Structure formats: structure tokens, C-alpha cells
């Protein structure tokens, strides 16, 4: 994945 | 069996140890009898005053009587546990155990819990778990040690009483035992720098953790059956090797972050909103568990902020291993 | 259940 | 140092742990702060009620204030002790210690002892040692562990306070630590069946006390047989180390006198128990009950001669015969200072 | 005077 971060909420 | 049957037994029971119990005390290298009698008396002072503070100043004598029922249950179960231990090992080797103030406080707290929870079902004020821990200055992890043995020792417990104590055990396993004041962390450190009790605890945590993971995976990841074992592997390694992430946090938070992390590296679309919505369906799940999660100091925020800032901080490189050409060796499934 | 000896590292 | 100086310090002191103390707590792997605060509050319940039982129902508030002074001394000494420990080891490794209920109860009991003994000198009901042990459900052996460290930690104790705590320590070493309810016996068993730095420390203190008392009696009684002291010490020492059950619910001095008496018998030197016993009563804190009332079996008490003949000898007959043997055992080193 | 670590077998 480009990022493991959750970009929501 | 019924509430009334147990309560009749306790109302008929003696306030003092039986001759059998006294026999056990007298066979110890260090005689615990006086410590045990004085501890019961002293805790009586504390209990009745804290009971009156909680329920009303006119309730001191009711509190005294409820304490007495607790003590009677404590002596009954103590004798039963000792009989069982002697039978199982074919010897009395009880001095270290019976002179352990923490064993006695945990057993008495468990007896008092059965009493408090039974009265708190009926009536005003709820004196059910964890109230008794604060009353007695007893840590959750210590209380945990006696629960299974208590259940086995008192054959007159109702199904509802047993279920309650099992619920208490689960709350301890999932969060209370992991608070910063918990003896658990010194036990982990002692082992990491060894403990049969540490092993037993972890075995029980793994089974609870896995069962909860399985329920979520069967609802969310039906299409991707291979994921559960991999998520379990991250989850289990995190509990074993990155236990500081559990400090002042909750088993299920680590669970949901493990689920999110693995799916993320496996190129599978599963946002937290979806996990969280399914989570609140778990038998005893509360929303606060994902809405209010410790980040740094006294700062709390959503499970997503915890995931993005703390969980991934610590485990980013560990998670990336799962998508690499050499994924970590998968953790065994806890049986039962 | 486990023995009390196990539960108390005895 | 004066009583007033110490009591002024305590009256000006905080009821709560200092910032420094809280820092020590926060640096522990397991945070002990809530346990420590709650333990102080809970024991306050117990103390003030037992104080009123002992002194009169109208004295609850006085008991409460005396308890507060003890808690203030407890925090003062705890912080001093921790500062010392950190300095000496160059590290804080305080979690196991600070989460030990028995450490706190011993330290709190010792602080309360200083307070109780000070008020009990002046006015009355005597609440001096061992009253506080019974109040707190604390064993003598556990109390013992903090005494020397407590004295070091509080530079404002009077000479009289120090002497009193040292007397408490001696009473614990000579008998209280050897009662059947004493954790000492599980510590011994653990070491005999399998190590303990605390056990070694306690024994080395007991050996010094034992020897110094033995040396006094030997100077007075056996001056024309100077070789006997070292031999009697050897029996005495080996009995304490290897036949420790003889000490259970008994007194260091009974073992001392029986060792003297037994060696003299095997070395064919007179020394009647009457002679030993008459010299014994001249020891600083010696009491007649110690040789008049000695535990034999179960809860039967009789004279020291009866103990020698039916219990002591029964256990040590073979060992004593070795001292009149062609190859006696190696003699035990004399304790340092 | 011995360390607290010694006195408590730590």
C-alpha cells in the first residue's frame, strides 16, 4: 500500500 | 440451585474457621491462624464504613451483616480449595499460600463480590464489581487468580452467579489487569529480563482474544478466509512482545488495529468505520472502547488516532513483514 | 482449574 | 536532637507525598501511587478505632491526629530511604519494593512506633512496642527489616528514640521473630530446601547479639577455663543454623544457657545451672521468666533444666559428643564486632 | 546499613 494510515474519521 | 439455597447455607454457617481449617493452619511451617482471624476483623472495620458511605449512614449494621455472610462464604470456599489442593497433590504444602495476604484478600473479595452482586440485582446503589476492589485496595489481576477455583469450590453458586464471575474475569483479562497499577507488568518484566501464573493468564487471554477475533472475521472477512490466521499472528505477537501497547488500553483495541493493519498490507479495503460498526455487535461491546483510547499522556481520542499515531508508530515495520517475500511464521490457534 | 500452587508460583 | 524539634518538623509536614516521592512512584514499572494513598487511608480507619478502644472512646480525634503525625514521618522516611537507595545503586529499581504491602506496613508501623513511644513516655496506657504490631496485623520479623534503615533515614530522632528502636530490634531478634507465626521459618525452609540476602543479614545480626551475650557470661563464669567460650559458641552457632526448630516459640538466651551447660557437662567442668541462671539475671534486660518458664512440648512449660534434658539434649546429644571426640568439628568463626 | 534491595531479596 502507498500508506498504512487510515485517512478517514 | 437458587439464591435462597445459597443464602440459607451462609446464614447457617459459622463465623469462625472449622476444626478442619484450623487443622490445615496448624500443619503450616508458619502458623497463619492469627493473621487470618485478625485480617477478617480488620477488613470488617473498613468494609462496614465504606458500605455506609456508599449506601447511607443508617446502613452500617446491614453492611456488617452482609460482610459476615461474605466471611462465611470465604471460609467455606477456603476449606474446599484446600481439600482439593491436598487431594490433587497428596500433600499439604500450604504455608506460603496461607500466609499470603494477597491470596486471602482475593478470596475474601470474591466471596464479597458474590454477596454484593446478589444484593445489587434486587433492590438503589450498585455495589457490583469492581466496587469491591476499591473497597479492599485490591488489584484486578490478584482478584482474577481465584475466580475459576472459587467457582469450582462452591457447588451452590447459581448459574447467574457463575456467569457474573466469568464476566468479571473477562473484564480483568481485557483491560483491568493491564492498567498501569497492575502487578501484571512486574510479572512480565521478571519473565522478560519463570512464572506459571503468567503463563496461565496469557493462555486465557489468548483464548478470549482469538474467539473475539474469530467472530469479527466471520462477519467481515468471509470472502477472504486466509486473513484470520494472519491477523491472529500480528495480534498474538503484539500481546507477547509489544505488551506496553496494552498498558491502560483494551484487548479489543489491539484486536481492531491488528485487523485493520493486516488488511491494509494485504490490499483489502476495510476502513475502521466498518470494523467499529461490527464491533459494537459483540456481546458486551461498548462504544467508548473505540471512541476513547489512550494516545500519549492524559490524552484520549478515537481508535483511529491511536492506530495512526501509536500502534503504527510501534508496529509499522512489523506489519510490512506480512506483505514481504518472507512473512513471519504464523502463530498457533489457541485450542478451545 | 489449575492448582493453587501454579496460580501462586509455588 | 529533642522531642520538640522532631514534633515541630512533623507538625509542619505535608499529609501527602511530595513531588519527589510522586516522581519515584511514576517511574515504577507498576505505579504504586493509588495503593500507597489508599493504604494510608484504610489503615487510618483501623488505627483510630483501636486507639480509641485502648485509651477511651473520647480519644478518637486525638488518635486521628497522632496517626497523621505518624503518616507524615512515614512519608519523610520513605523519601529519604528512596533517595539513599537511588544514590547507592545509581538507578531507580523501585517497583517491586514500592508495590510490596509488607514494606509499607513495616515502614508505617515503625513511624507509628516512634510516635506511640514518644507519647507513652510522658502520660497512662502504654502503647509502645509491640502494641503497634497487633494493631496492624504485622509480624515482628517484617517490622525488624526497616529499623536500621529508618534510624539512618531520620536525622532528627533523639538518642532515646534510637535506643528504643534498637531495643525493639533486639527483642525481635531474641524471641519475637522465632514465634510459630513468624515468616522467618518459611524463609529458612526456602533456603534449606534449595537463597536469601535478608535471611543472611538477619542471621549475622542474631550471631553478633548471641555472641556478645555469650561472651559476657563466659567472662564471669568460665574465666579459669578460657578455651570453653569458642567451643560453646560453636555449638550455639551450629544449633541456631542447623537446629533452628529448637528456637520455635523459645528465646535465644535459653539456647545460649543450654549450650554453656551442655559443653561443660561433656568437657567435665562443673557449672551448675543455678550458677548460670544467677549470672544470667545480671544481663541488662534479662528476666527470670526466661529460665523459669521454657516451652517443652505442645503448650507445656517448665524450667530451663527440664528443657535441657527433655528437648535440647534429645536433639543435640550426638552433636555434643563430638566435642569430646578425638576429632572435634571445626570451630565457628567469632562474629565481627 | 544494608540496601533495601538486600533487605527484600530484590
UniProtKB/Swiss-Prot annotation, chain B:
How is the polypeptide modified once translated?
Phosphorylated by CDK6 and CDK4, and subsequently by CDK2 at Ser-182 in G1, thereby releasing E2F1 which is then able to activate cell growth. Dephosphorylated at the late M phase. SV40 large T antigen, HPV E7 and adenovirus E1A bind to the underphosphorylated, active form of pRb. N-terminus is methylated by METTL11A/NTM1.
Disulphide bridges in this chain? none
Where are the Phosphoserine residues found in this chain? 182, 331
Tissues expressed in: Expressed in the retina. Expressed in foreskin keratinocytes (at protein level).
User: Where are the residues of the annotated region Pocket?
Assistant: 1-322
Protein location: Nucleus; Cytoplasm
Residue ranges for the region (Domain B) are: 194-322
The organism's place on the tree of life at top rank: Eukaryota
Q: Where is this region: Domain A?
A: 1-193
Spell out the subunit comment.
Answer: The hypophosphorylated form interacts with and sequesters the E2F1 transcription factor, thereby inhibiting E2F1 transcription. Interacts with heterodimeric E2F/DP transcription factor complexes containing TFDP1 and either E2F1, E2F3, E2F4 or E2F5, or TFDP2 and E2F4. Interacts (when hyperphosphorylated and hypophosphorylated) with PKP3; the interaction inhibits RB1 interaction with and repression of the transcription factor E2F1, potentially via sequestering RB1 to the cytoplasm. The unphosphorylated form interacts with EID1, ARID3B, KDM5A, SUV39H1, MJD2A/JHDM3A and THOC1. (Microbial infection) Interacts with adenovirus E1A protein.
Entry text on domains: The Pocket domain binds to the threonine-phosphorylated domain C, thereby preventing interaction with heterodimeric E2F/DP transcription factor complexes.
Question: What's the family?
Answer: Belongs to the retinoblastoma protein (RB) family.
Output this protein's name: Retinoblastoma-associated protein
The record lists the organism as Homo sapiens
Q: What is the lineage of its organism?
A: Eukaryota, Metazoa, Chordata, Craniata, Vertebrata
Complete-protein stretch covered: 380 to 785 of 928
Swiss-Prot record, chains C, E:
Residues in coiled coil: none
Q: Where is this region: Interaction with RB1 in competition with E2F1?
A: 2-10
Q: Where in the cell is it found?
A: Host nucleus
* Role, per record: Plays a role in viral genome replication by driving entry of quiescent cells into the cell cycle. Stimulation of progression from G1 to S phase allows the virus to efficiently use the cellular DNA replicating machinery to achieve viral genome replication. E1A protein has both transforming and trans-activating activities. Induces the disassembly of the E2F1 transcription factor from RB1 by direct competition for the same binding site on RB1, with subsequent transcriptional activation of E2F1-regulated S-phase genes and of the E2 region of the adenoviral genome.
Q: Which family does it belong to?
A: Belongs to the adenoviridae E1A protein family.
- Subunit structure, as described in the record: Interacts with host UBE2I; this interaction interferes with polySUMOylation. Interacts with host RB1; this interaction induces the aberrant dissociation of RB1-E2F1 complex thereby disrupting the activity of RB1 and activating E2F1-regulated genes. Interacts with host ATF7; the interaction enhances ATF7-mediated viral transactivation activity which requires the zinc binding domains of both proteins.
- Protein name, please? Early E1A protein
Species of origin: Human adenovirus C serotype 5 (HAdV-5)
Swiss-Prot record, chain D:
Domain of life here?
Eukaryota
Q: Where is this region: Domain B?
A: 195-323
Q: Which residues carry this modification: Phosphoserine?
A: 182, 332
- Show the segment(s) annotated as Pocket: 1-323
Regarding how it is modified after translation, the entry says: Phosphorylated by CDK6 and CDK4, and subsequently by CDK2 at Ser-182 in G1, thereby releasing E2F1 which is then able to activate cell growth. Dephosphorylated at the late M phase. SV40 large T antigen, HPV E7 and adenovirus E1A bind to the underphosphorylated, active form of pRb.
* Places the protein is found: Nucleus; Cytoplasm
Q: What is the effect of changing residue 213 to W?
A: In RB; mild form
- Tell me the segments the record calls region Domain A: 1-194
Distribution of this protein across tissues and organs? Expressed in the retina. Expressed in foreskin keratinocytes (at protein level).
Known role? Tumor suppressor that is a key regulator of the G1/S transition of the cell cycle. The hypophosphorylated form binds transcription regulators of the E2F family, preventing transcription of E2F-responsive genes. Both physically blocks E2Fs transactivating domain and recruits chromatin-modifying enzymes that actively repress transcription. Cyclin and CDK-dependent phosphorylation of RB1 induces its dissociation from E2Fs, thereby activating transcription of E2F responsive genes and triggering entry into S phase.
Oligomeric form and interacting partners? The hypophosphorylated form interacts with and sequesters the E2F1 transcription factor, thereby inhibiting E2F1 transcription. Interacts with heterodimeric E2F/DP transcription factor complexes containing TFDP1 and either E2F1, E2F3, E2F4 or E2F5, or TFDP2 and E2F4. Interacts (when hyperphosphorylated and hypophosphorylated) with PKP3; the interaction inhibits RB1 interaction with and repression of the transcription factor E2F1, potentially via sequestering RB1 to the cytoplasm. The unphosphorylated form interacts with EID1, ARID3B, KDM5A, SUV39H1, MJD2A/JHDM3A and THOC1.
State the family named in the UniProt similarity comment for this chain.
Answer: Belongs to the retinoblastoma protein (RB) family.
Q: What protein does this entry describe?
A: Retinoblastoma-associated protein
Upper taxonomic lineage: Eukaryota, Metazoa, Chordata, Craniata, Vertebrata
Name the gene for this chain. RB1
